[PDB]
Amino acid sequence: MRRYEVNIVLNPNLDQSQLALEKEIIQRAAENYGARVEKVEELGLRRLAYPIAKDPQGYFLWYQVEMPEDRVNDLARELRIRDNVRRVMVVKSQEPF
């Protein structure tokens, strides 16, 4: 197991209902791939470095997870297939919470 930060950008135009659903899907996927979700932060709306799906902003979520290294790429791939997920970036945790 190793600790990673998962940075997720979502469609900025979601209702709180839809948003809550997307977070539930993310957590189930992480658990299905063996991750322990240690911390979740809702960062909120930011201007993207470049527009995605023609929208210049995105709703940001950040997770600190501990999970097997061999499954990290499969989880990122599973997350990127939801239509509301605009961007996923996973980095190794340097200064964990």
Side-chain angles (χ1 to χ4, degrees):
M1 304 261 136
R2 288 211 162 78
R3 208 146 247 132
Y4 290 97
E5 300 173 3
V6 183
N7 294 265
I8 298 168
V9 184
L10 304 176
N11 174 346
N13 308 302
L14 293 180
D15 283 323
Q16 53 148 217
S17 218
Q18 300 180 117
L19 193 283
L21 172 62
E22 295 295 345
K23 291 176 56 198
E24 250 160 27
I25 291 179
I26 288 165
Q27 238 264 174
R28 172 179 100 169
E31 287 171 351
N32 268 301
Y33 281 94
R36 290 170 51 244
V37 178
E38 300 183 317
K39 191 173 171 74
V40 190
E41 282 301 318
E42 286 197 38
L43 274 38
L45 297 171
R46 300 172 75 161
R47 174 83 44 98
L48 299 176
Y50 57 93
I52 299 178
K54 237 13 282 168
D55 271 320
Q57 60 201 28
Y59 190 92
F60 281 54
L61 293 167
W62 176 94
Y63 292 76
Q64 183 173 289
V65 298
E66 188 184 31
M67 64 177 301
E69 83 170 356
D70 75 329
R71 298 277 256 166
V72 175
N73 191 237
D74 294 322
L75 175 61
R77 287 162 103 284
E78 173 92 39
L79 301 178
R80 294 180 175 124
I81 67 143
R82 284 288 299 165
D83 291 318
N84 284 321
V85 169
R86 293 272 165 97
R87 192 177 73 196
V88 179
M89 188 177 309
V90 177
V91 295
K92 220 204 261 63
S93 160
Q94 310 177 59
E95 297 186 313
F97 279 85

